[PDB]
Each structure stands twice: as C-alpha cells, then as structure tokens.
C-alpha cells in the first residue's frame, strides 16, 4: 500500500504545516502537525478540559472502533515549551488513503496554552523512532512503524512548499518530484531521531568547507539551527544583519537580497535559496525581518528544520538499518 496527503502552511510565514488525518469510525477529520522529531500521535478530544479547547476534537464515544488501552497513560513535552497528557485509545487511523488499524491515539485530558491558542492545529502525528514514545507502562508504535508491514517500501518522503502546498508520501519515491539523483547518508538511532552527519557547507558563491555537522531532520521545527561558527559565516555576507537579544536571533532589513546557503550530503550539495532564509517581518509592516538560519547552541543539537527541508525532496528510509536521502528540486 501507499498514501499521499497534501500538507499546507498554517499561516503566511510557513510556521508549521498541517496534514489531514482521519480517526475512528465514522472518520473524524482532524488537521495534525506531522513531526519527524517526536513519536506520539495525540489529539484534542471530548475529554479535553473545556476551557482549554478553542480546534476540531476527537470524540472516542462516537467511534465504534475505539478501544480503551486499560491502565495506559501518556505525558509529553517539546523543545518550544508546549505539553499535553491523557489516556490512550487504539483506533483506526488513515493518512492520504493509507489505513492502519490498532494505532495508539493518545486522547488529551489537558493541553498547554500554545496548543489552545493555535486554532489551526488539532494535534500531532510523530514520525521519529518508537523508542521516543511516551505511553506507560508499555510504549506504543508510530503510525509509520505500524504501516511498514503493509507498505510497498519501508519509506516516507517529505516535500514541503515555500509559501505553497506540498506533499507527504508513504511507501514510494515520486521520481517527478525532484531533479538530479538522491544521495543517501548513514543514520544513527542511538537518540531515537533521524540523526545524520552533513559533510560541510558553503555561503552564497563562496568555498565549501569540509566540517562534519551532526544533526536531526525535523519537520516539526520551523527554522534551520546550525553551529554558531557556521551561522556567523552566513550572516557575515548580509550587510544589515545582526543578532538581536530582545527578538531572540539574527534579524536583517526586509529589503535585502539574501545569499543562498549550501549543505553537504556525502559528495552531493543542497542549495537553500536566499528568499527561503527570509522568515518574514517581525510584525506586520515592520522594516525588519527574522532570519531563517539561527544558532543551535541553546538547543544543544543541530536541527535541519523546515527552512532546510523545504529546499529538498527528503527520503526517510526506515529499513532495519535506516538511512536518509536528499535530492534537489
């Protein structure tokens, strides 16, 4: 089997992307954030405290296929400070036409304020390795891990758009969605993520520096977080750019024509256009814009988030020894 679903930016800045997900019988359609940096599928629900709901909710008592997982609970927190917790059902879940039975659906009793405030996101669908799932006493498998027995190839691909719709595919590689060839590189699962080592970088039309960059491919992170020395080398080529303590990163004049940024995948090169690195005005009408490349020092790991991934066609190869592929597009 395969699935193919359209993923759409939630707002004018590409802060996150939502993808429809059908849960239960009859299907209840919720818009979820597909996240290669976590491993829980959780939703707003009829159990969620009423004052914390503003979203479409899952009602397990209206789904004939829902089963309570007796004794199971979950509790999760994320790098941006958000969190949620609750109890666990198994139910039928479909993405882009691909159906999994017995998927753990984590029903929120409570959600944090950032989730209440974001009317566009009805929950998360995690796509990292299942060792990161938060259900106790026994951890639950991701939608991808449950799908692998049935998929045509144990792979999924991410094709995110720049201020435009894009696609998540499960089980196949669309050879019309990219240019040149895919180059694959080794993955380490020792921390539960799609973790790999880039071979180096170049800024604009300058020289490629061979320096190993260990990082994670994360569709649920907005920006590109890289080592401080690398990020400094980039913004040195933007004459108005400066680090802003109060705003929380590099800012620059919206009128600038930004240089591209190139990263290494083995001997191959992925070029991020300068326009993608303009994240947008700090407020509507401002003359100052927020940078899309920021230092990873405060997070403690490098993160190839949406700014990087939306410049590439990205293959998440979930074979027993996993690998990660990138192509230009």
């Amino acid at each position: 089997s395969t699935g193919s679903a359209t993923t759409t930016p939630i707002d004018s800045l590409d802060d996150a992307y939502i993808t429809p997900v059908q849960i239960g019988t009859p299907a209840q359609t919720l818009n979820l954030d597909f996240d290669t940096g976590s491993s829980d599928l959780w939703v707003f629900s009829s159990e969620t405290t009423a004052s914390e709901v503003x979203q479409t909710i899952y009602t397990p008592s209206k789904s004939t296929t829902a089963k309570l997982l007796s004794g199971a609970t979950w509790s999760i927190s994320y790098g941006d400070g958000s969190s949620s917790s609750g109890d666990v059902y198994t139910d039928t879940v479909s993405v882009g036409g691909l159906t999994v039975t017995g998927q753990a659906v984590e029903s929120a009793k409570k959600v944090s304020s950032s989730f209440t405030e974001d009317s566009t996101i009805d929950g998360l669908l995690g796509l990292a390795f299942s060792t990161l799932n938060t259900v106790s006493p026994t951890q639950q498998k991701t939608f991808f891990d449950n799908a692998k027995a049935s998929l045509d190839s144990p792979v999924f691909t991410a094709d995110l758009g720049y201020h435009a719709p894009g696609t998540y595919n499960f089980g196949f590689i669309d050879t019309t969605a990219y240019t040149g060839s895919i180059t694959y590189t080794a993955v380490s699962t020792k921390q539960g993520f799609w973790e790999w080592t880039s071979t180096g970088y170049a800024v604009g039309s300058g020289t490629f520096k061979s320096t190993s960059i260990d990082g994670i491919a994360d569709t649920g992170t907005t920006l590109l977080y890289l080592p401080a020395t690398v990020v400094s080398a980039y913004w040195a080529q933007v004459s108005g750019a400066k680090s802003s303590s109060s705003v929380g990163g590099y800012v620059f004049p919206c009128s600038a024509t930004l240089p591209s940024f190139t990263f290494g995948v083995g001997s191959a090169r992925i070029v991020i256009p300068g326009d993608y690195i303009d994240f947008g005005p700090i407020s509507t009408g401002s003359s100052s814009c927020f940078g899309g490349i920021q230092s990873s020092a405060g997070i403690g790991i490098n993160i190839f988030g949406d700014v990087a991934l939306k410049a590439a066609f990205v293959v998440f190869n979930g074979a027993t020894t996993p690998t990660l592929g990138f192509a230009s597009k």
Partner: peptide, 6 residues
C-alpha cells in the same frame, strides 16, 4: 516558531 520532543 515551533520546535517539536524532550
């Protein structure tokens, strides 16, 4: 901006 698990 978003940053998805700890």
């Amino acid at each position: 901006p978003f940053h998805x698990v700890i």
